[PDB]
Amino acid sequence: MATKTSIHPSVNELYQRLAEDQLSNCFDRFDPQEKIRCNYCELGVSCQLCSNGPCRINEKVGATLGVCGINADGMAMRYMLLRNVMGTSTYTYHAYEAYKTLKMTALGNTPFTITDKDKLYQMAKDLELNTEGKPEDVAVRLSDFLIWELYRDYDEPGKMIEVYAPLKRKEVWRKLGIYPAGPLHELKDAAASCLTNVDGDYVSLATKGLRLGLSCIYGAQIGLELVQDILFGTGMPHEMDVDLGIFDADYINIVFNGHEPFVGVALILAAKEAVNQDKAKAAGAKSLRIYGSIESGQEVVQRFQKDEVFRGLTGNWLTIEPMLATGAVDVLAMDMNCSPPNLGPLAEKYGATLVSVSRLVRFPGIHHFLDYKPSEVREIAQKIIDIAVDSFKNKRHGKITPKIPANIQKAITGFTPEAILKALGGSINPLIEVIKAGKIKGAVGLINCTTLKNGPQDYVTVNLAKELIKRDILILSGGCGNHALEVAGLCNLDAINLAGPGLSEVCRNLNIPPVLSFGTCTDTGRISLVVTALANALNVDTADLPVAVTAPMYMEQKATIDALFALAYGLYTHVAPDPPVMGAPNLVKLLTRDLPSITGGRIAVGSDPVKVADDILAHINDRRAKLGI
Amino acid sequence: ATKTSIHPSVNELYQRLAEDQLSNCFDRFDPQEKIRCNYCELGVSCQLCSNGPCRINEKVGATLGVCGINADGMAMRYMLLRNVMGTSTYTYHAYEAYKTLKMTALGNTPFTITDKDKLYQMAKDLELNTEGKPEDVAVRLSDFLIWELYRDYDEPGKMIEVYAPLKRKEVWRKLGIYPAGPLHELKDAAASCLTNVDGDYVSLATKGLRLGLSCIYGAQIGLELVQDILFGTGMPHEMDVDLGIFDADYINIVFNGHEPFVGVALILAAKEAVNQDKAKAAGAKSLRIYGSIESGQEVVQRFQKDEVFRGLTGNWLTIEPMLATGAVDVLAMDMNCSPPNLGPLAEKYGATLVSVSRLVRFPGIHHFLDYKPSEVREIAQKIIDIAVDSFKNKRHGKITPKIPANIQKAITGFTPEAILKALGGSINPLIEVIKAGKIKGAVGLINCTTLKNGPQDYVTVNLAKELIKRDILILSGGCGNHALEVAGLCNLDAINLAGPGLSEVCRNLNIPPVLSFGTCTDTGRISLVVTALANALNVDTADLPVAVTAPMYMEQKATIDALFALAYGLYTHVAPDPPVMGAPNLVKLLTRDLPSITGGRIAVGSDPVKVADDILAHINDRRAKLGI
Ligand code: SF4
Ligand code: SF4
Ligand code: FES
Ligand SMILES: [Br-]
Ligand SMILES: [Br-]
Ligand SMILES: [Br-]
Ligand SMILES: [Br-]
Ligand SMILES: [Br-]
Ligand SMILES: [Br-]
Ligand SMILES: [Br-]
Ligand SMILES: [Br-]
Ligand SMILES: [Br-]
Ligand SMILES: [Br-]
Ligand SMILES: [Br-]
Ligand SMILES: [Br-]
Ligand SMILES: [S]
Ligand SMILES: [Xe]
Ligand SMILES: [Xe]
Ligand SMILES: [Xe]
Ligand SMILES: [Xe]
Ligand SMILES: [Xe]
Ligand SMILES: [Xe]
Ligand SMILES: [Xe]
Ligand SMILES: [Xe]
Ligand SMILES: [Xe]
Ligand SMILES: [Xe]
Ligand SMILES: [Xe]
Ligand SMILES: [Xe]
Ligand SMILES: [Xe]
Ligand SMILES: [Xe]
Ligand SMILES: [Xe]
Ligand SMILES: [Xe]
Ligand SMILES: [Xe]
Ligand SMILES: [Xe]
Ligand SMILES: [Xe]
Ligand SMILES: [Xe]
Ligand SMILES: [Xe]
Ligand SMILES: [Xe]
Ligand SMILES: [Xe]
Ligand SMILES: [Xe]
Ligand SMILES: [Xe]
Ligand SMILES: [Xe]
Ligand SMILES: [Xe]
Ligand SMILES: [Xe]
Ligand SMILES: [Xe]
Ligand SMILES: [Xe]
Ligand SMILES: [Xe]
Ligand SMILES: [Xe]
């Protein structure tokens, strides 16, 4: 049937049950779309932006330009920028709601508290805010300042990019003129440029894409992740259970799924109440348990420990459909991507109830809607707990047969730059010395999603991670590719012996895995804080560091914006499968050949793990040779 | 080319463009027709993630995309993502206008405060502080409107309470479509269109309605009122249109786009004697400034013709033939439409392309002058200088001019104040002429132009003729308004082409049967007319004998006004068909089920007679329900 499924045997076992129930799934839907693939759109030489279209680029038949007059390069780059507007919008949405959450928490209208006060005061100092009074007043000040960072216009200088970016990179950006405004104004200008007969210059549209990436990282991601640190704590390494074997059908299981962790931690807090556990027990279940899915669950497992209520991480987005096939989910609380639009019939067949906690998430089949609100989240949480208890009693218990796979995997989560400092001994210099000694050739930022385009689920990512660590290359993993690596067993101590000589030796001496789970794609900025550190200790530019960035199985634009950032950051950025720009030769030449003389980085292609690893190692060794190491 | 224009001048200049073996929109349309994608034409395509691209095809088994979305959600999501761009353009213009007003209040621009009466009346309607001198009040109004731009979800708006009718506001409350600021709304909509987020076409259509609402009451009304306060409220006056206004012996600077600040600065600087002496020293008779598309339309709404400013050239499909005249020296571009292939044409005909905005970029532009209110005085001068050299070294003596002879008269500058003055200071006379059957109803023709459903401006002009013959008044905005001005439907001569009652009313009031109200950005301005008639009757806007048509729409600045008209509860005609016709449930919601939700509905068709007949049938249905 489906030609490509997954590398995880649990996901395969559950896809087989999905297919046995004759329910549609992504794997089964891939091939019918393969039958009628459009090479125009796949090469990026098609457009749909105006009524004179739809236009295709075909010079051998006489259609050199669109009806407007744009060429293939401008077409591809403009479409890319247009959809990257969406990723910037998602990150800015997350950041704004995080700042609102911190503001409403500092004034006592949330079930949340200010956990990391050290980080709050350090941010207040570095951003030159007023530190007088209570910590909550400083939290309100930081909320307002980061909202202002969101709101910055084209003519107002920002402070986050001055604090969290190295000197030479800021020099490169100011000499390129790609110093961005606030992410709001930046995405506004990008979308306004993508309109018909506005911006049709592929160089200019790529410049605006780099501007949008910088806007996203320094105006949204860093601030939101540091505010989440202040709220729920800075992550420290701890052991965690992943893969779908963590499910138990005898419990009222609630799964939160999205990107923002507020609903999930509110559910954990409300489930710690004895009254709700007594409700779960009086309903006929053992107790009430909460599970974390994709990036929301990743955020939560970065900072929270495994107990009787919180049981771990389910997987990546391609695991959501088979997860419902377990027949063990009572509530799937959804706040952002991914919430696949055909989840209705699947939850109806397996006895699950779908609840959306966001005004962004809507699709056919949802049972309840509880738009997020910091002053309401507590109540929201409770309502979800009252929904599951009802669902469990009326739909799943004694009616749905569970099919929970046996695969449970150990994974070390919660790695942060502070955790790197702590494991090294408070200083980054030992990492410097093991990099200069040749034991660790370099570090790779694997900020990745997952997709069925360039192979089965997580094949490219996991096999490329193995190939990378085999060549003494450390990996900082974020995104759904990080979920893939945690499930595949590469994020625990047993994985030490899957690394090459130097990397395995150093990781055994430090008692850390060769793949450090830094969390989500939102942590890309956080990962930059590592590279910036490596750039500040050496007084060398980021483009000269033996570092690399890879998204071996990207899907939508939350990773394309991180790739555009890494390009503006001046890094070798591998992206697979091919973004739809290959029908534009000039843009391809700019992205893969010209940019190293503009920003410093370039775009790498390919889905072969061995060859991608070889090219990454070759770039790292070039950087080493020019560093004298 | 199988399709060109109904205007003789543009056909002649297309002939010259074809003589020079140069590419143009008319010629580029046909090669695209041989290989049209029916999928994208019907809106059953998607390119949002790497598991794609996907197409909806139930026969071969592709009922859903790899994500799981259906055709309805796919089409509506692509429509919402596209209209994000139009919302962004409107928000960009509004924010630049607010910054321009505030910087003018501090004495950093060549501008001033022309309409202080409107400044203070709007300050009082918004309950602002009237204290101090007009500069302070202007600063306060700018800050308030900027706050409107940044408004989020728990901050109720004040523009929508002041400028919207009662029953429409109650309907928007019970529907839950009361929008935030346009910035937050466009960001929320763009985030909803990401893969595996919002895949319900009903939710996406509700978000499109919210987007249009946040665009009209969060940007358009305020930006046009601010531009009025800066450059005076427009009043009806004579204007020359079509490309016959060009004279090759002068140094011609044409401002083209949407935002008119660069145009006003250019006019002001060109009126200076030193710049006219610079023009004369180059061998030219004098120095003239011309308006093009929507920026031109703003200026011609507010400015009369004189020795310097000459009027409007045409609409967007007239840009390439305009360069073909061989008379342009500088084409200053501030926004859309700026065709991305103007380089070779400007090289052939000796014109210099200048971009006065960081949004406009394409190969061949010779100078970039990103607009800043505190620099617009030095930009204009530079432009003028760039013209002088470009006159001496490129055009004068080498380029053969081919200026067409067609010139038309148009009465421009029709505003709600203009209607109120022409009616004697009250809305009751219009109520009487409508209730008596003289004017069956009014129609807002807010439109672009395109080659999709016919030659340039064919459907627009013919539909306007049929409407005015059916005793239906027309308020025209956008490039359709330019088409009507060039065709000669906005002067008194057009009264002979109106029906009996409409011609009687127009002869009594001395107005044309088509009122040139400005740009698509003036849709909200037109929304103030309907609202007024809704408040005098105490009826909802869905009960009024009004309608809205975009018979040759092109991009999303028109589709967002159509989404507003839908949320406004109006019969909204749009042609050609937007890419949704492959989504049966979405077409059902837009064309059939929306009357029970908002009151309005989408109408389709490019046959002028049938479209006018359906519009008149809707107006007569409303009339019968009103008892008139
Ligand atoms: S913007 Fe240009 S290329 Fe795109 S559909 Fe319109 S005419 Fe065709
Ligand atoms: S968003 Fe969905 S329908 Fe669109 S290309 Fe991706 S998988 Fe296909
Ligand atoms: S699917 Fe329409 S051009 Fe590719
Ligand atoms: Br094809
Ligand atoms: Br401090
Ligand atoms: Br402060
Ligand atoms: Br050409
Ligand atoms: Br086809
Ligand atoms: Br005074
Ligand atoms: Br003036
Ligand atoms: Br003079
Ligand atoms: Br300024
Ligand atoms: Br009025
Ligand atoms: Br009267
Ligand atoms: Br159709
Ligand atoms: S990602
Ligand atoms: Xe299904
Ligand atoms: Xe052909
Ligand atoms: Xe993309
Ligand atoms: Xe919020
Ligand atoms: Xe609370
Ligand atoms: Xe670039
Ligand atoms: Xe917490
Ligand atoms: Xe809130
Ligand atoms: Xe239920
Ligand atoms: Xe670090
Ligand atoms: Xe490390
Ligand atoms: Xe890295
Ligand atoms: Xe471990
Ligand atoms: Xe080590
Ligand atoms: Xe990075
Ligand atoms: Xe990219
Ligand atoms: Xe990336
Ligand atoms: Xe690329
Ligand atoms: Xe559209
Ligand atoms: Xe501005
Ligand atoms: Xe005010
Ligand atoms: Xe504001
Ligand atoms: Xe709707
Ligand atoms: Xe009128
Ligand atoms: Xe008046
Ligand atoms: Xe009326
Ligand atoms: Xe009207
Ligand atoms: Xe109207
Ligand atoms: Xe309107
Ligand atoms: Xe529309
Ligand atoms: Xe419209
Ligand atoms: Xe429609």
The Cα–Cα gap between B256 and B318 comes to 11
Give me ligand 11 centre to Cα B332, in Å: 22
Q: What is the DSSP string of B88-107?
A: HHHHHHHHHHHHHHHHHHTT
Q: How many helices (H) and strands (E) does chain B have?
A: 26, 16
Give the number of beta-carbon pairs within 8 Å between A and B.
Answer: 308
Residues 6+ apart with CB under 8 A from B617: none
Subunit contact A341:B196, Cβ cutoff 8 A: yes
Please, where in chain B does CATH 1.20.1270.30 lie?
71-231
Helix (H) / strand (E) element for B221: namely helix B221-231
The Cα–Cα gap between A12 and A25 comes to 12
For residues B498 and B468, the answer to whether their CB atoms sit within 8 Å is yes
Nearest to A302 by CA among A288, A312, A314, A291: A312
Residues 6+ apart with CB under 8 A from A175: none
The residue with tokens 């330009």 is: A65
Give me ligand 39 centre to Cα B557, in Å: 20
The Cα–Cα gap between B98 and B224 comes to 10
Q: What is the DSSP string of A305-317?
A: ---SSEEEE---G
The tokens of B66 are what?
A: 């790899």
Peptide bond into B8 cis (omega under 30): no
The tokens of A64 are what?
A: 């050199």
The Cα–Cα gap between A228 and A597 comes to 37
- For chain B, the helix, strand and coil percentages under 3-state DSSP, each to the nearest 5: 50, 10, 35
Fold category of B71-231 in CATH: Substrate Binding Domain Of Dnak; Chain:A; Domain 2 (1.20.1270)
For A205-261, the three-class secondary structure string (H helix, E strand, C coil) is HHHHHHHHHHHHHHHHHHHHHHHHHHHHCCCCCEEEEECHHHCCCCCEEEEEEECCC
Residues 6+ apart with CB under 8 A from B101: B138, B141, B142, B226, B229, B230
B197 at A interface, C-beta within 8 A: yes
Helix (H) / strand (E) element for B312: namely strand B309-312
Alpha-carbon dihedral angle through residues B394, B396, B402, B408, given to the nearest 10 degrees? 110
Nearest bound ligand to CA A446? 33
Between CA A149 and CA A158, with CA A153 as vertex, the angle to 5 degrees is 40
Subunit contact A93:B187, Cβ cutoff 8 A: yes
Q: What is the DSSP string of A109-173?
A: -SS-----HHHHHHHHHHTT----S-HHHHHHHHHHHHHHHHH--TTS--SHHHHHS-HHHHHHH
Give me ligand 18 centre to Cα B27, in Å: 15
**Total number of residues shown for chain B:** 628
Binding residues of A are 38, 41, 47, 50, 55-56, 68, 259, 338, 449, 480, 521
3-state secondary structure of B45: strand
The Cα–Cα gap between A547 and A57 comes to 37
Q: How far apart are the first and last CA of chain A?
A: 51
Phi-psi region of B297 (alpha: psi -120 to 50; beta: other; left: phi over 0): alpha
| Class of domain A409-627 (CATH, top level) | alpha beta
| Class of domain A72-232 (CATH, top level) | mainly alpha
Subunit contact A338:B557, Cβ cutoff 8 A: no
For residues B220 and B149, the answer to whether their CB atoms sit within 8 Å is no
Between CA A97 and CA A102, with CA A99 as vertex, the angle to 5 degrees is 110
Nearest to A75 by CA among A215, A205, A254: A205
**Total number of residues shown for chain A:** 629
For residues B152 and B181, the answer to whether their CB atoms sit within 8 Å is yes
Subunit contact A364:B36, Cβ cutoff 8 A: no
Q: Rg for chain B (alpha carbons), in Å?
A: 24
CB contacts under 8 A, B 519-558 vs A, are: 553-557
The Cα–Cα gap between A28 and A334 comes to 23
CA distance B89 to chain A (A): 5
The Cα–Cα gap between B494 and A174 comes to 57
With a Cβ cut-off of 6 Å, ligand 31 is lined by A 445, 524, 527-528, 531, 549, 566, 569
- Whether ligand 44 lies within 6 angstroms of the CB of B615 is answered as no
CB contacts under 8 A, B 556-575 vs A, are: 556-557
- Whether ligand 43 lies within 6 angstroms of the CB of B442 is answered as yes
Nearest to A529 by CA among A414, A422, A428: A428
Fold category of B408-626 in CATH: Rossmann fold (3.40.50)
The tokens of A169 are what?
A: 């990179």
Tell me the one-letter amino acid at B468: I
The Cα–Cα gap between A334 and B196 comes to 11
Residues of A in contact with B36 (CB under 8 A): 54
Q: Within 10 A of A437 (CB to CB), how many other CB atoms are there?
A: 11
The Cα–Cα gap between B391 and B275 comes to 14
| Class of domain B237-395 (CATH, top level) | alpha beta
A6 alpha carbon, distance to own chain's centre: 20
The Cα–Cα gap between A463 and B27 comes to 51
Q: Strand B441-447 relative to strand A55-56: parallel, antiparallel, unpaired?
A: unpaired
The Cα–Cα gap between B120 and B118 comes to 5
CA distance A74 to chain B (A): 9
Please, where in chain A does CATH 3.40.50.2030 lie?
238-396, 409-627
Q: Within 10 A of A238 (CB to CB), how many other CB atoms are there?
A: 17
Stated resolution in angstroms: 2.5
Method for structure elucidation:
X-ray
Q: Within 10 A of A121 (CB to CB), how many other CB atoms are there?
A: 16
Quick one: DSSP state of residue A542? G
For residues A128 and A159, the answer to whether their CB atoms sit within 8 Å is yes
CB contacts under 8 A, A 309-328 vs B, are: 317
Give me ligand 8 centre to Cα A474, in Å: 48
For residues A180 and A564, the answer to whether their CB atoms sit within 8 Å is no
Residue B177: phi and psi, rounded to 5, are -105, 15
The Cα–Cα gap between A568 and A173 comes to 8
The Cα–Cα gap between B213 and B163 comes to 12
The residue with tokens 């076992």 is: A13
Q: What is the DSSP string of B358-391?
A: TT-B-TT--EE----TTTHHHHHHHHHHHHHHHI
Cα torsion B104, A178, A95, A449: sign: positive
Residue A118: phi and psi, rounded to 5, are -60, -45
For residues B556 and A197, the answer to whether their CB atoms sit within 8 Å is no
Residues 6+ apart with CB under 8 A from A595: A567, A601, A602, A603
- Residue A506, CA distances (Å) to A420, A437, A472, A509, B393 in order: 13, 11, 10, 5, 70
| Buried residues in A522-558 as b, exposed as e (16+ CB within 10 A) | bbbbbbbbbbbbbbeeeebbbbbbbbbbbbbbbbbbb
Q: How many helices (H) and strands (E) does chain A have?
A: 26, 16
For residues B456 and B321, the answer to whether their CB atoms sit within 8 Å is no
For residues B375 and B395, the answer to whether their CB atoms sit within 8 Å is no
Please, where in chain B does CATH 3.40.50.2030 lie?
237-395, 408-626
The tokens of B426 are what?
A: 């009250």
Q: Residue A39: closest CA among chain B residues belongs to which residue? A: B53
The Cα–Cα gap between A286 and A397 comes to 12
Residues 6+ apart with CB under 8 A from A176: A207, A210, A598, A599
Binding residues of B for [Ni-4Fe-4S] cluster are 258, 337, 448, 479, 520
For residues B448 and B520, the answer to whether their CB atoms sit within 8 Å is yes
3-state secondary structure of B323: helix
For residues A413 and A491, the answer to whether their CB atoms sit within 8 Å is yes
Nearest to A318 by CA among A463, A455, A157: A455
For residues A325 and A14, the answer to whether their CB atoms sit within 8 Å is yes
Tell me the one-letter amino acid at A11: V
3-state secondary structure of B52: coil
Answer whether CATH 3.40.50.720 is correct for domain A238-396: no
Please, where in chain A does CATH 1.20.1270.30 lie?
72-232
